[PDB]
Amino acid sequence: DQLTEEQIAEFKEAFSLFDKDGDGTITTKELGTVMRSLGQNPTEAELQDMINEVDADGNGTIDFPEFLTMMARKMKDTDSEEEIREAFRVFDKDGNGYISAAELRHVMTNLGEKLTDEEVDEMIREADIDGDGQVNYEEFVQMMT
């Protein structure tokens, strides 16, 4: 598990943005302040749900280890999702937000595989949850996860 000196410093910088009074904990109120600066307006119940899911020891506030543990997991999810989004843009040759059978067939060709229309149509139907005849990003991601 990688955590360099520089990575630790960056986590403390992010933590300090939340930890308004520098006591080493993040409360629901400090989280509200940050969320409002992002243009959101959560209720106290919503803030408590956000704290609760990060608050591993259940003492009501977020300490650095809890914060870093959650942030590192979120960063990995975001990295992984971005890799999936990049693949989707590559497959979606005309950039219209759907992978068509023809696009999928050309993709296969470029990867050294020759499929018939029949075979690619099958692959599309497999992923085409909403029945529009093509594969959108949500449908693609569902096949990856």
């Binding site: 497959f91 595989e113 692959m123 497999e126 096949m143």
Partner: peptide, 20 residues
């Protein structure tokens, strides 16, 4: 006899292999 089908995940991973 029959043709084997490819998966969406295998396609994704095949691209992953070919990139720098």
């Amino acid at each position: 006899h029959s043709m084997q089908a490819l998966s969406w995940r295998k396609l994704y991973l095949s691209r992953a292999k070919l990139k720098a």
